[model samples]
Target: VTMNDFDYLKLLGKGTFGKVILVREKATGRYYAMKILRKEVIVLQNTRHPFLTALKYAFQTHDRLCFVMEYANGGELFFHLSRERVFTEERARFYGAEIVSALEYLHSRDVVYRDIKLENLMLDKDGHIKITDFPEYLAPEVLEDNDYGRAVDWWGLGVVMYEMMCGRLPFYNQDHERLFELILMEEIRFPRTLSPEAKSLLAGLLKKDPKQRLGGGPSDAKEVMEHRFFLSINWQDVVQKKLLPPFKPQVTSEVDTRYFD
Candidate 1:
């Protein structure tokens, strides 16, 4: 359908780049979110995978651009984490595995997934991470103003895993400058709350030196999947979407916002 084909439903959220609005296709009655980006930037425009929010349409005007993409009914990981405060380790592990797979696909391409936090990760109707990031999952070098590449995604992966278990980021504050220091120079710490296994993965990913980071090899993210941390995870099954996620959101309809709040 055309851009005019959607009947606006509601505002999904807002960001540094633009706003996302939920809309329904008039002819098919299916739902989607249209991201009207402010900056003339978009990543993964031609990329597609089950773990990513597929871009259906894109067009640019003199001053703006809009990306019509998959509408995740279950909402973002941020919402669920807010609801539960902290997920059980098992739940966090499942999300971590999925995140790894999503990164593997994106990094396999020339594209680097810059965003990988709870907020950017949206869950579909069946409860897979939609990885709805147009841009962001900050790598350490990005924070330090250093040249960066694929390894940065793993750095963001560490940040997300820490937040899931500790209910907070490893380095978070109202002060942006101080926060930058912590992200670039601070030592990564884990609470007693984090299991030893999880801690192992975190340590490998949270390295200040990108060259020393977990997925810094030729195999890249595949090295992470082969790590002892994910011994129980079947990479093939995870990629195939055969492994059932540990938790699924309570979604009754496409128009349902109950899963949102």
Candidate 2:
């Protein structure tokens, strides 16, 4: 598509390295959220992940990378959770179920999404969840050749799940080094306010031993779908987006549409 085909409508966000914009396509009048990355980073680190927002096209613009991508209207899961206070156990289970499904899909394709956090999750107008941002993804076989592998994704999953339920990170110290130390060494614990079932599921998934961790072994997505916490979910409907989401996002007119132009 020609650059003129899209009209930049508003600013979505800015990061240390990149910026996201909302633009409307001239031909279809459809909006898209485009993330612009530095050419050096795109070339230095190849991008891959089916769930990660893919670049529709990338062209040079003033020595920068103009990456076009599908636009998601729903904002970051982090904003949603934080605005609503901590998620209830049932609400956490519902959202966590969707994330597990996405993770399973990625793993089956040999893709490990190293970054699995609320900030990376997006919701559609209909409340369907979409996992985005995949710069941290690495193929399992590729990771195996290096020092990291599929295990990293599992750890990230636990972290994301825990954060979703508790409204805070499991290991957060004022010092970044101390935070990671806690992550690597400390045992997972649940707040007294959490339900027993929630604690049980979180404990299983957050197991430090990757080998013995929940859904960490040779188990596939189907195995995870059968988890006790997700017992009430309609598997077929969930994958098809037919089931109603237990929790719905509250949107405001003040929300900048520029991000999803």
Candidate 3:
């Protein structure tokens, strides 16, 4: 849809480079997440991905590049999980499976999603996840030349999953650099709340050595899927989004929809 077709509903979220808005297409009465980016930056960057967030349609309005994206009404996964009292093993496994699928899809396309934090995951109306925020992505070739790739996503997955089960980050320090140092050096301690099977899986995924980590190898995601923690998961049903999500976000008036506009 063109810029003229939508009416901005509210502010969704913002970052250093851009902001996302919730807008409605007047003709169809459908909602969308519109990301507004600086045209100068857009012209300079190559945007491609296997499972990356994409511009459904983009056009210029004056000097800005307006990108209309798929709107996920269910909001951020971080917000949903953090507000809850706790998460069960079944719920964590269900959500973790979706994240793994998305990561696997991205890796197959040679796209490395450098950022895989909870805040980057969005949910659809039915509670299925749609990973968002693509600016941080790098090509596998680019990352391989350096010291990143599937390993980074695996580390992030560890952090996200750990938080899902424990309701907090594994590393609780306030310093940013120190946090990275902790992640790179310290071993993660699974919360007592987590099951033994889940804890074992988290440890493997959290390995610091990129070359030896769970998703570090070409078959990392596949190896992860076979873990005993996910033994009860029906792989086909999850890919089809036919299984019930163990945990669903409880959207309330307290959520600031204005952040979307």
lDDT digits (tens) for residues 1-261 of candidate 3: 477898877787776677788787788676777888766665213453323455567777777877787666575776777678457777888888888877777777677677788778877666777778731222232334565666788777877787788877776644555654455456677777678898888888777666666767767687788888889888777777778866554444323343242
Instruction: Give one digit per residue, the lDDT tens place, for model 2 in 1-261.
Output: 557778888887787678888777777776676677675654313454333555566666765777677655566777778787687777776677777766776778777676676667877555567676621322232334453455556556666767778877775534555554455566767788877767777786666666666777787555456767777888666666667766554444323353242
Candidate 2, residue 121: how far the Cα is off, in Å? 1.1
Task: Report the Cα lDDT for candidate 1.
Answer: 0.78
TM-score of 1: 0.88
Work out the TM-score per prediction.
0.88, 0.78, 0.82
Q: Which pairs of residues have clashing backbones in candidate 2?
A: 22-261, 31-261, 33-71
Q: Clashing pairs in model 1?
A: 114-136, 114-137, 115-136, 115-137
Q: Given candidate 3, what's the lDDT at residue 47?
A: 51
* Selected candidate, larger TM-score, 2 vs 3: 3
Q: Give the lDDT of residue 136 in candidate 1.
A: 36
Error of 3 at 135 (Å): 18
Return whichever of 1 and 3 wins on lDDT: 1
